[PDB]
Amino acid sequence: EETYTFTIFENCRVGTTVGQVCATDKDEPDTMHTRLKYSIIGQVPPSPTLFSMHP
């Protein structure tokens, strides 16, 4: 999708889950050529540091 959304209250705790992002690849299934890995590349506004994700 081009839109991935969550809602949370303020005054939170570390580890509060905020959902998942997903992807699929036109190479052959059950191979490396479609195996994936994930990361964070920025936030707006840039600070504070607030989030984390499953590699």
Next chain:
Amino acid sequence: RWAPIPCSMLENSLGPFPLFLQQVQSDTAQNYTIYYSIRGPGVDQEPRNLFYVER
């Protein structure tokens, strides 16, 4: 225990922010997988998140 190294921050600036102050790191970072953390007044106590570290 020997004396601390000082750092100095000017008032009412326009940045750009975040504005750099200090760098320390554990001499074991080439030896273990480490990240850095901060606490005290000026972050987890008031005034809050006034200072930040990059882990």
